[PDB]
Design a protein around this nucleic acid. Structure first.
Ligand SMILES: [Mg+2]
Ligand SMILES: [Mg+2]
Ligand SMILES: [Mg+2]
Ligand SMILES: [Mg+2]
Ligand SMILES: [Mg+2]
Ligand SMILES: [Mg+2]
Ligand SMILES: [Mg+2]
Ligand SMILES: [Mg+2]
Ligand SMILES: [Mg+2]
Ligand SMILES: [Mg+2]
Ligand SMILES: [Mg+2]
Ligand SMILES: [Mg+2]
Ligand SMILES: [Mg+2]
Ligand SMILES: [Mg+2]
Lengths: 107, 63, 153, 50, 354, 60, 61
RNA sequence: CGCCGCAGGUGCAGAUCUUGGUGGUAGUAGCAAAUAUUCAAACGAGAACUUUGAAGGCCGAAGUGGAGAAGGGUUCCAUGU
């Protein structure tokens, strides 16, 4: 199915390691976009604005170590575009990341 | 499409800065049709242009 | 207009041309030599791959300082690049060339780029400012491009 | 400057009126030999005499 | 897709009675037009009759608007069309033997019935009017009968203009350059489906190659001049304007804003006249025209001594033969020409009717 | 608003408008435009209306 | 409909000044039409009226 | 233009020669002073750079703020390309 929705947790700390201070938060959203491209196979990824705030919540260098996102593969609703499907990456606030699995979210 | 004129007019009508001018991102075409300060006044009255509040600089820690 | 290399069978040939195109002559010449002799569909896919940096054009003559790449091993070469502006300009000229093909009536699924040539256009002049009150040229190097496609299968 | 004399302002007035493109119908005149205004002046590029 | 058309029999009936009103007011105009009258007086009484008649009809549906679709325009021997003097403007006195050309429009539901006619005033009973002005009106009348006969979906729009050019050359006259008839839909007098007469290279390339389509309204309009075909301006105030609803702009004038609102309330989408307002109207119209919120309907002049004639009317297109709802009171018994038609197609179409 | 001669002062503009147009004016403000032409803002008397004087002049 | 200096010379000083005054009023109206659009006919009459003003003044002088 | 005479501002590879044009260098040096950008949308053929909104930042009142003198002279302001 191509209208699937799932919960993921991305190790931002793992993918940001080594990046300089003024490039850390911008690199985090490039790694989030790459994560959605790999997981959902869609070239078109749209980061939610609330997730953008969550990434930049602690500035440009102290990016949060883990982020809990939701990936939603949806039809593009614009037939003129080359891509049939796009992935909307939303922000999921969580109190803790322990024992958090990649789960399926229904409609 | 390009609300540089409208933001400048709204700051002068509201007697604030362009920092404090909030043009509606959804009613972009309605703002763009306003080319006079009186039209800006109608938009401000009708809630399409809001003067944002001052950034909080509290003195509670100082006190 | 007087092309060079008039086609052997002008009935089964379509022509396209551009003049004073503001792209680098050296980059466009190498791209033209890469797509020469290609099929029309293969050249269109190749130029789209060049912009996506999945295939590269080999810089064979104007290769001073051009870096190496892994995709140059597709050709018998080591140096290659991905000129985006040259690939987009040649893609526009290819669409014009194939549009002339439907107008003449010959089908566009068997067209092959038999002729392609990049000439130097007259230079445009600009200025740059140097250390001790000196003005030096900042010239542009535009180019004319002409191509001839031919039905063959 | 904002402060100026009448003679200077009149001088700038003539230069303003003089700095304009040639009319389009000039090209259609017989034996024109005029392509474009060769005396066009830009404020930043070439400064006035005064 | 929601626009209305002739597919309703209620639309059919309101077309017919509105055309009957438009015909009865042209008849009252041509009877009232005697020597010593003022064109300003004739236009204001003609529009007054229209307003009271439209108000007294369809009083059971007053959510819509009923009234003038085009102001009463009366042109005499020197004006092509779109003529409506103001009270402050100079007047014209009607004399003996002058031919005058009256345009008029009535609307219901935004659907419009439009009609015009050319006639000589103070004509003695049973007598003959001759001259170079007596064949231009006859050729234009043959153009009106040509439009009536051949208006049918299945024909190219260029056949109309070549037929009008052919009858013009036969009569040694020419049409008016750049005159456009229009397709009429709801609240529209400037329909995109347009018909050109007397074209040139520039107007031909701007025109559209189209074919007439079933179940719609047309306003076939012919303007024939006995002269050369030159129409220009000699400094007369343009009075007729039409609101353009596609565009808008921020008005900087209180009087122009009030004037534009008055256009919205009374003549929102269709041409009007400045007579209906005037001291503040003349100021409020120039700035709206400057920013292209109102399309001016300029007055046109020709060389003094030349003569032009108009003939237009709304025609309904139905596959079982088109029908006419607006007609002008012309009689060929007292009008004859010095030159006759020599084309077989032209003499066939004037004989035949749908 | 008028475009007047560059040598005419406020008194001359005031008398010229009165004679040419048979109206009385209250005051005349004067500037010189950047293109060199003098422009006069001629206020009219309270009993005179600039709207219908503009009509009889022909600039409405 | 033009003005000729040949037949102007018989006129007295009073009606010569009257004819000049009418031409100046006509020219001022033609300048009004020039800035308010006007027409090509009224624009081309500007030079004709200006020449007539010069003609009357030449005969007066 | 040939032949008979006549008269020269009469023959170029140079002169760090004069003027104009063009190469290799070379798609090379380089586009590294003053911390910094990101997400979404709109217009648009086309958006890292335009505009709006949301964030994160900087100037930190001896300002990257608000106004003037000299100087500039229409750069001011709308619309359009
Ligand atoms: Mg090298
Ligand atoms: Mg430099
Ligand atoms: Mg220097
Ligand atoms: Mg400087
Ligand atoms: Mg002053
Ligand atoms: Mg020598
Ligand atoms: Mg030599
Ligand atoms: Mg040499
Ligand atoms: Mg030597
Ligand atoms: Mg480099
Ligand atoms: Mg660099
Ligand atoms: Mg700080
Ligand atoms: Mg400052
Ligand atoms: Mg500016």
């Amino acid at each position: 199915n191509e209208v699937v929705t799932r919960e993921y947790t991305i190790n931002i700390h793992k993918r940001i390691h080594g990046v300089g201070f003024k490039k850390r938060a911008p690199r985090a959203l490039k790694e989030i976009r790459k994560f959605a491209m790999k997981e959902m196979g869609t070239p078109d990824v749209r980061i939610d604005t609330r997730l953008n705030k969550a990434v930049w919540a602690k500035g440009i260098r102290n990016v949060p170590y883990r982020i809990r996102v939701r990936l939603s593969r949806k039809r593009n609703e614009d037939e003129d575009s080359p891509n049939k499907l796009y992935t909307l990456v939303t922000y999921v606030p969580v109190t803790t990341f322990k024992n958090l699995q990649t789960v399926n979210v229904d409609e | 499409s390009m609300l540089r004129l409208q933001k400048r007019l709204a700051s002068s009508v509201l007697r604030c800065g362009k920092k404090k001018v909030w043009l509606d991102p959804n009613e972009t075409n309605e703002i763009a049709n306003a080319n006079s300060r009186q039209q800006i006044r109608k938009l401000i009255k009708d809630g399409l242009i809001i003067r944002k509040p001052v950034t909080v600089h509290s003195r509670a820690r100082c006190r | 207009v007087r092309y060079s290399l008039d086609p052997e069978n002008p009935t089964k040939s379509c022509k396209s041309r551009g003049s004073n195109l503001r792209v680098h002559f050296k980059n466009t010449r190498e791209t033209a030599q890469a797509i020469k002799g290609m099929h029309i569909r293969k050249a269109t896919k190749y130029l789209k791959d060049v912009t996506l940096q999945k295939q590269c054009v080999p810089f064979r003559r104007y290769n001073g300082g051009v870096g190496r790449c892994a995709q140059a091993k597709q050709w018998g070469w080591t140096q290659g690049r991905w000129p985006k502006k040259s690939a987009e300009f040649l893609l526009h000229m290819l669409k014009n060339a194939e549009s002339n093909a439907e107008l003449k009536g010959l089908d566009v699924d068997s067209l092959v780029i038999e002729h392609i040539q990049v000439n130097k256009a007259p230079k445009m002049r600009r200025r740059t400012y140097r250390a001790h009150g000196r003005i030096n040229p900042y010239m542009s190097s535009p180019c004319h491009i002409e191509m001839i496609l031919t039905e063959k299968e | 400057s904002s402060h100026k004399t009448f003679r200077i302002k009149r001088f700038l007035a003539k230069k303003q009126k003089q700095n304009r493109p040639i009319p389009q119908w000039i090209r259609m005149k017989t034996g024109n030999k005029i392509r474009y205004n060769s005396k066009r002046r830009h404020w930043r590029r070439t400064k006035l005499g005064l | 897709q929601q626009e209305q058309t002739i597919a309703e029999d209620l639309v059919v009936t309101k077309y017919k009675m509105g055309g009957d009103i438009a015909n009865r007011v042209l008849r009252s105009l041509v009877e009232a037009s005697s020597s010593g009258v003022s064109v300003l007086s004739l236009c204001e009484k003609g529009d007054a009759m229209i307003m009271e008649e439209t108000g007294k009809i369809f009083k059971k549906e007053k959510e819509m608007k009923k009234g003038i679709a085009f102001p009463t325009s009366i042109s005499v021997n020197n004006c092509v069309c779109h003529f409506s003097p103001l009270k402050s403007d100079q007047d014209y006195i009607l004399k003996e033997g002058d031919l005058v050309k009256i345009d008029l429009g009535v609307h219901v539901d935004g659907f419009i019935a439009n009609v015009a006619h050319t006639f000589v005033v103070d004509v003695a009973q049973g007598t003959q009017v001759t001259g170079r002005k007596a064949d231009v009106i006859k050729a234009a009348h043959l153009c009106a009968e040509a439009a009536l006969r051949l208006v049918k979906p299945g024909n190219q729009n260029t056949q109309v203009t070549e037929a009008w050019n052919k009858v013009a050359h036969s009569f040694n006259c020419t049409p008016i350059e750049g005159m456009l008839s229009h397709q009429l839909k709801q609240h529209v007098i400037d329909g995109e489906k347009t018909i050109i007469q007397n074209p040139t290279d520039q107007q031909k390339k701007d025109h559209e190659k189209a074919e007439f389509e079933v179940h719609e309204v047309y306003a076939v309009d012919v303007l024939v001049s006995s002269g050369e075909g030159k129409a220009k301006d000699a400094g007369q105030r343009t009075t007729i304007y039409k609101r353009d609803p596609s565009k808008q702009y921020g008005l900087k004038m209180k009087t122009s804003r009030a004037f534009f609102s008055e256009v919205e309330r009374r003549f929102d989408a269709m041409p009007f006249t400045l007579r209906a307002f005037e001291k503040k109207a003349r100021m409020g119209v120039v700035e709206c025209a400057k920013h292209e919120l109102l399309q001016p309907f300029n007055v046109l002049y020709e060389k003094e001594g030349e003569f032009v004639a108009q003939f237009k009317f709304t025609v309904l297109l139905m596959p079982n033969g088109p029908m006419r709802i607006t007609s002008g009171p012309f009689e060929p018994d007292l009008y004859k020409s010095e030159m006759e038609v020599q084309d077989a197609e032209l003499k066939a179409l004037l004989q035949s009717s749908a | 608003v008028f475009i007047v001669d560059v040598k005419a002062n406020k008194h001359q503009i005031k008398q010229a408008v009165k004679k040419l147009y048979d109206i009385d004016v209250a005051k005349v403000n004067t500037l010189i435009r950047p293109d060199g032409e003098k422009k006069a803002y001629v206020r009219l008397a309270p009993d005179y209306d600039a709207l219908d004087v503009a009509n009889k002049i022909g600039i409405i | 409909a033009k003005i000729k200096a040949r037949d102007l010379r018989g006129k007295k000083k009073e009606e010569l000044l009257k004819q000049l005054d009418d031409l100046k009023v006509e020219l001022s109206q033609l300048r009004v039409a020039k800035v308010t659009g006007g027409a090509a006919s009224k624009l081309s009459k500007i030079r004709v009226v200006r020449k007539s003003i010069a003609r009357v003044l030449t005969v007066i002088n």
